[PDB]
Design a protein around this nucleic acid. Structure first.
Lengths: 98, 99
DNA sequence: GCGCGCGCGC
DNA sequence: GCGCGCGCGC
């Protein structure tokens, strides 16, 4: 079983998992120099569709393409179908990384 | 040393019956009246409280009710379980044709 | 397997 | 605003 990665980098597209929500189309944001240091090994997440943000570790992240069809099915939670759209057609919304 | 569960049961006896996939479950030995197709060897007709389902099971899957009450008697959220706990105390002869 | 809850319908 | 379907988590 090919492992899910243990480290990600700014700009990667993923599905992210939070309790109560289905695996959600998302992106690894940049971690700027200059800020308060995040929790260890937790990554800055940008959810597509909602543009909400959080920090998550690799345990809850899934590479977009690889895990696409297990997770990319339409669903009625507000903003989900909008996220499916953005991750394909405008994946860089508010992307500061580069 | 450990007390044997009964290897024989009598019509009317109250038990927890175990079935594959279900928790140990509040139940009763029904009568097997003559005039019917004979049961399989050493199996008893079982009445499940709450669901009122029925089946045949052998001594190995039956546990005397009072004795095993505290090990199996706590609430469970399978459909009709708690309704069974209730019945086995308050209306245990429901649909009992045995006597 | 089963109850909660979100999100849409009527 | 209340019902119901379906997907969440336990």
């Amino acid at each position: 079983a090919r492992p899910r990665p243990r480290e990600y980098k700014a700009g990667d597209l993923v599905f992210a998992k939070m309790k109560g929500y289905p695996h959600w189309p998302a992106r690894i944001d940049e971690l700027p120099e200059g800020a308060v240091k995040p929790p260890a090994n937790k990554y800055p997440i940008f959810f597509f569709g909602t543009h909400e943000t959080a920090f998550l570790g690799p345990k809850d992240l899934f590479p977009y393409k690889e895990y696409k069809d297990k997770f990319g099915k339409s669903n009625k939670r507000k903003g989900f179908n909008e996220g499916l759209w953005e991750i394909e057609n405008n994946p860089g919304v508010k992307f500061t990384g580069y």
